[PDB]
Amino acid sequence: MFMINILSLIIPILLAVAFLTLVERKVLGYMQLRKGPNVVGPYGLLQPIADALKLVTKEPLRPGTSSISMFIIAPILGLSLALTMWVPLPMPYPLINMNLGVLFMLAMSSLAVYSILWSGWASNSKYALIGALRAVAQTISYEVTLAIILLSVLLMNGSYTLSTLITTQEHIWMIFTSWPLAMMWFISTLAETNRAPFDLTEGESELVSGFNVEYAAGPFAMFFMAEYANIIMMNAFTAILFLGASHDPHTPELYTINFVLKTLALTITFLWIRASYPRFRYDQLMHLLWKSFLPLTLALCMWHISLPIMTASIPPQS
Amino acid sequence: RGEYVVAKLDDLVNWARRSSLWPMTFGLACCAVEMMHMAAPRYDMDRFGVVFRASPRQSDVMIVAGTLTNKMAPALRKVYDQMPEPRYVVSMGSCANGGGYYHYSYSVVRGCDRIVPVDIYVPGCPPTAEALLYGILQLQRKIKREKRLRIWYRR
Amino acid sequence: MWFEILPGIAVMAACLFIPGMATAHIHKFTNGGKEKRVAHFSYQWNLMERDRCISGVNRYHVTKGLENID
Amino acid sequence: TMYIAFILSTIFVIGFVGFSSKPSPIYGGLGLIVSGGVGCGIVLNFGGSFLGLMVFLIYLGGMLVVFGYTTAMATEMYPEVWVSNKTVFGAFVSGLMMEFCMVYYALKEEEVEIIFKFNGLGDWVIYDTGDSGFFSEEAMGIAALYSYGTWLVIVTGWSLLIGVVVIMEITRGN
Amino acid sequence: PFFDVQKRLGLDLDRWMTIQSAEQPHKIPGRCHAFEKEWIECAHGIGGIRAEKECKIEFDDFVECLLRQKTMKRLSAIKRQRDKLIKEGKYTPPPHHLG
Amino acid sequence: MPLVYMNIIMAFAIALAGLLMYRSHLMSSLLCLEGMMLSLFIMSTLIILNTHFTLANMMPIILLVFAACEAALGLSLLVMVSNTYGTDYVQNLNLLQC
Amino acid sequence: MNIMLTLLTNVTLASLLVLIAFWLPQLNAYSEKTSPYECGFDPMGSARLPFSMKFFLVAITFLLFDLEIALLLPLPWASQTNNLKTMLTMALFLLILLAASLAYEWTQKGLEWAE
Amino acid sequence: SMMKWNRERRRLQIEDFEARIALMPLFQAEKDRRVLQMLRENLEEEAIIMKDVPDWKVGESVFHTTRWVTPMMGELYGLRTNEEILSATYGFIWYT
Amino acid sequence: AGRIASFLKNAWAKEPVLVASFAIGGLAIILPSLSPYTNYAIRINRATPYNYPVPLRDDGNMPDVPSHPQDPQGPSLEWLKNL
Amino acid sequence: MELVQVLRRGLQQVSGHGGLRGYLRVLFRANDVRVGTLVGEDKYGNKYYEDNKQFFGRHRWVIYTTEMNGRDTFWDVDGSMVPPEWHRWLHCMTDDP
Amino acid sequence: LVSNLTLNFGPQHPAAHGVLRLVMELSGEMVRKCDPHIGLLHRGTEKLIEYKTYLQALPYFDRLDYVSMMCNEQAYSLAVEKLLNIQPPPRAQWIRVLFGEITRLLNHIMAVTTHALDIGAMTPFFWMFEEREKMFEFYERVSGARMHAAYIRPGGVHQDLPLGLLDDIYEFSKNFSFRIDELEEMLTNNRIWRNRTVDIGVVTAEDALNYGFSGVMLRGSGIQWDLRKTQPY
Ligand SMILES: CCCCCCCCCCCCCCCCCC(=O)OC[C@H](COP(=O)([O-])OCC[N+](C)(C)C)OC(=O)CCCCCCCCCCCCCCCCC
């Protein structure tokens, strides 16, 4: 039965990724006075299937200068991390219930930077390596703000347990208590998934596709699935962290509906950023992180350590 | 018999391959702007599943939109070679078709079909975005009638 | 126009709803119709281990009340 | 399932043999992070949840990550491979066989005396029997860094600030 | 310390982590608290030279508590002697030891 | 002692041997140093958790942070050497023989 | 152990997706097809292109900041002590030292992507 | 609002902790008998297993001190089924 | 007067992020030392009963230790109920 | 009540295509379920529709025949199937069918 | 160890504005020199014109700046008319100015929107390419071709405007400023667009003059010069 739980978690997530491709294309199209996929199936509903089928029957050109061991290990690591990021998530009850769930997510997402450091190195070409190094530096630099923002927010939670976030946000959203940290967290999440003006590793008009140039068909498809799973997962984490839904122990379907709707709204906002802004330069986003986000994050961590102590509002640790 | 299963599988694979025709933006000259007009909202090539793609490693069709010069032909053949298969070439405009206005020039190759095999020849100088869209749908119908698995079953 | 984006969003919503509902219902099924007991600390684990021993059926969630002895 | 910490420790030592035989530093780093992951698992099996997750987040996702990033810049024109040297194979093979011989001896004898006396009676055997109550003893011990460990915080923070100053002194290159 | 600044200035800089029988958070006990306490109370103020011989029993008990080496030997003997009689079909473990 | 301790101490010995037996690259030796630190971390953690030395739970954190500071220093030294010679090869670090 | 089963399933399914992805398509490969992509020409290997001290410096500064973050992670449990004034003093001390490291790197060029 | 709520969550935790405190004498009394019964059952078995080992003497404390020593897992479950000792060692750690 | 006001003006006009961060950090530094509630937080932490309250033997002359949990002796949490 | 009228207009699009089968036929052939005014039918089976309240470029359309010159064209249609008489009206070179 | 990355490529790159080989060496992150390699679209136009009659050479100018077709053919027509000592009629001149300004709208839409798309603001490209499609319709209604009208000729224009064309041009133009507003609502004040354009590619006015710059590349540096005013045609 637990195996069935794992399967009924993984497979719907991959399906949601597949149709997130369609949803993103349609949202971009309608923001651009066009339609997007509306021919292949009703309202493009069979388009993700067409993409998945075409990709797995397309020739996966592997580079002659590629260390194939890591060339295939990188997609495995990426997709395995992208899937395992959902196992502690408290759609009302988690698959895996840990004391340190958000710490587990921080660690697992920090292991995901290897899939770029290994793909760029394995692909050789002597230039995709530079794009991979830029991506890794961006990822590790925004890990700092992710970690510190999570630390400051959880000082109202009292623990690293994600189920406790539901209890913490019973009467009020955590957004009303930490909105500046919410904006910085949301932009950090944007930057970590290489999205929006932070998509420097796959700049369509900067370096064509960067670290993913040599990957084609199948491994490219799995990398794409990993990225979109990470996008939906990060938006789910954001919804649980800042927009906690009311929970009825006798009707958890209500919480699930609430959470899914809020996660979809945040994902649609992620696609909304993509259609509205130009692209940051690499040094420009590094400057943003290091000289704008980091000082405010340090100050707000200070503030959120001081605040529960000076108001006798320290949460329980149980 | 077992030729019905092979025919159905061929139909499935050829529906998936023409429903996700991802082309490569080879905009050489004036024909490039009518192709991004077929990209524009009025025609919206994305509604057919025909996305705005990137590096030839994820492209299924080459659109030669513009004059090919002698200085430029080796690069066109290089990126054609780098396309994974199955791959198709659409020649768009008189210049790419057979040289066009510059047919008798010292520096112009007379038709991209001297460099690459071409599947569809879209006439016009430039062809209207609707003409290019017609060529794209005609290419889609070419893919629909391929019989790769039925060829294999009778080998 | 824009409401034709809604079918893909509905498919996404169903695919995202499935995991949470499945987790809740599997937890109810395998825990005696009640919520899966949470043991973050050794005291809760010891509570569950005592529960398993006294149930006689080696299941912590079979609850013995005052009908068992008193 | 009966033995989990022993497979984890044997794999730990195997990874140590792998990266300490020193192939090209990218494969050495891969071996080091495999060893770090299995060691984080080892200390997870001992109840050190926070410590193992620290291993992960800071060692494998921090320190390593930085190591592989820096190797990706200062390497060879053809970055080497494990196979390229017979010395790597010899060192790895000798380490693997000295692992196998000693684990077999300890398993079937339980009184080896390689420097230290050892008894492979199990690994669960040394665990004590008791309740930790309503808190993690590890977390309470580590959170005491700010109440009991004032001096430790002072010296560690000073050393980290000095580390920033020191790195900026050395790398200036004049 | 080479220069006992702590004992001159009355400061507790690192003596609090120096033994496991020192005060602990939430009064969580060390595993070998009593053994360490007895060895420390034996060896207090008589010098290391005297404490090495005159507190040997307490330190031996402490070391056994820390690394249960002799306990492990006795358990290993019981285990392997049990098997020594399973093969011959001599000893049947009782119901509460099999389920 | 239990056999996990045996394998952890064995890992430390292997890392020490790998560091003492050099090869061309400096990064390989630094990785051996890191392995030595990681084995020390795990040994300390096992000893501290097993004996329930609660205040000593923080010692592995301190060991990890200080050893990572040393690793940063060594990485900077390697980078300077490489900028001098284009490689991190230790055989170029021999001009102090005279 | 449930978590081990979950990790095994995730890794196994990812590798199976590799196997279908990397063996199912029909292949026909020649030399010029798999040549490295350089926008229509051949790439130059040159000699160890990934250089510049700034890429290494950001990694080192991230490492040191990550170490201080490791020092900050026990904070949610640290607020549960009776001796709250000492704990607050030390947590704020650590954060001032983080801010001081950032400021010192900032003022002494540091974080800059120079010429 | 968070002040109000976190203040309420602290009294609820005090109530839960006091429920545990009230229950603790029962659990301590039970654990003592359970541990003593397991130790004595091991003793009764080893009196049989060790009959023929020549210089063996059963019940012999490894420690010089006659003070009560809390047994390890090996002394408690060293003669029981792999599932039981696996539970007693890793059931809490693995429970997720 | 005008010098510090002008510096604050320039900082607010060109580096609002640093102004906000320094003000927030300064308040986080300063405000806890003035709060009446910091002592309350200390008291709440002290009143959380993690351990068992192991009893004492009344040797006589223990008139302030309760005897029973519901005797009018020993600390009271009535203050916490209304806070 | 305006969303009520939007839903009514959709439902009348279902009814305006002669039922659900006809609605799905035009949904899956033309990827469009608008109901226009029939201006005429050519000898090849193509039907031509105008709706002057649509914006320019959508106010006129053809639902292609399913059979033309011995070729099945239920799914496989193209703009070359429009005869020159209707080609002029369809591309708005004139206002007269 | 000077290994300045000599990435001497990028023709197939989507941001290469068509066909452009860039030979680039960087001192780490920053550009040290740019070496544009052109000729990838050299078709021998100037030699072919020598084999063409004066009328036969006019369509060659549509395909030089294939974003500003009618302006190129206006320039060629003005040159040929100056050599012929003849004068186009007033109505033809007004039509030429009107379609030159329509052409300027087309070209500026293409330039600004493709600049933004290369920077990473893809959305304004589509909104304005709809207006470009409408102006293509104007081109085709006057000449039968959407891009290469060949409409402005030495002596005037080929044929007169069809009835109702001025009304449609008026209908389009009365709404176009709202689209410029929407384009500016996305770019002009955006802190990311300005970060990618402010103080980037600064050219001195005197150095702009000595490098042969013209148009916006001159007036960007404050030079008050426009051929439509100083040397009107
Ligand atoms: C009693 C109360 C005490 C506590 C008070 C706490 C402080 C209150 C006042 C602070 C307000 C500001 C908070 C931080 C804001 C960001 C800081 C920063 O550097 O900003 C400027 C920075 C830098 O701006 P800049 O570039 O103009 O300035 C840089 C510095 N100078 C001025 C010197 C040039 O800008 C950004 O961060 C831009 C982000 C780009 C992406 C934009 C995304 C748009 C969509 C957002 C949607 C909503 C997000 C959240 C969604 C929901 C999530 C749950």
Ligand code: SF4
């Ligand atoms: S065919 Fe005509 S429009 Fe196309 S590139 Fe050639 S000259 Fe330009």
